[PDB]
Ligand binder design. Sequence first.
Ligand SMILES: NC(=O)Nc1cc(-c2ccccc2)sc1C(N)=O
Length: 347
Amino acid sequence: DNNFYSVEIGDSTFTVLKRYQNLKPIGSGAQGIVCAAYDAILERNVAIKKLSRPFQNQTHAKRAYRELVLMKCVNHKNIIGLLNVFTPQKSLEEFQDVYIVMELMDANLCQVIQMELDHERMSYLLYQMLCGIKHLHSAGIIHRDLKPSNIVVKSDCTLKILDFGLSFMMTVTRYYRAPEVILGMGYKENVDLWSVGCIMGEMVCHKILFPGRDYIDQWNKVIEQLGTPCPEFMKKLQPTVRTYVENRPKYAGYSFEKLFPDVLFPADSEHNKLKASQARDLLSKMLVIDASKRISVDEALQHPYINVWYDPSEAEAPPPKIPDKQLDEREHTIEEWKELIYKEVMD
Ligand SMILES: NC(=O)Nc1cc(-c2ccccc2)sc1C(N)=O
């Protein structure tokens, strides 16, 4: 076009608005490739995600539609903001790709996990995650898919959640899935606190807590560390699941003192010893198999480890106004999704 130019990013073509220069690949997902770029108008670096034929199947479509809608109506410091959205295609018939422009962050949490963090940074990152989750909950959004790769960080320790979480498609969130998602029992808002527990545990010990090769192994990994759950939990399971869970080898589990010893934390000073004890107590309330006994986001935000950062403008921010049942995920055809997405892009 006269407003667009094309650069080759591997085996992929990025056709972007001329305002975006010096494209550099920073990552890839099932949706598409992400480039760092310089925005010459705003005079700041951005991230541009290319969504190739998002309407291609119902899974990509629902995800692309939810991403577009929620990014346009949410304005919270701990949720990635939408700077721009475009398509190089001139019409619906030619419509192929969607490009989402976001603020560029310095790293994702996978990188932070490979660092020892002092409690001030650790507790501030965790506080921000919980604010972002609490904001999603206040609008009726349960993430359910939180993992370190979808959480990004800046140099000044600011944190942002990249996606809104959410079937079959062709060509690693499982480690962070709550027992109620693993055992197909339905879920509440605190399904997200299990994922925070997984992420926090990983930020402390630098290794994936429950690295199951599948859902059966995933359950086995959970029970080995935490122990076989109460009979009160077993009674909440459907008979076919209740039989499978009850017939597994029995595990006593480990105390959080053995799972997360002082050797894994800064614990030299009296300040750090107290923080390590507080961080351990928080881990023990998040990594709870039975969701009815698990910490809520608000109790987590008010926990001694977290509450030093508590700011109601962040933790009690007015909920976003999602234009009704727009994300109910009703089945649509390939062409219906193609139209719904195009209309959201064009506005
Ligand atoms: N540094 C870094 O990982 N940045 C980053 C990475 C993103 C990403 C999103 C999906 C897949 C692969 C990478 S989006 C984004 C951003 N907005 O800063």
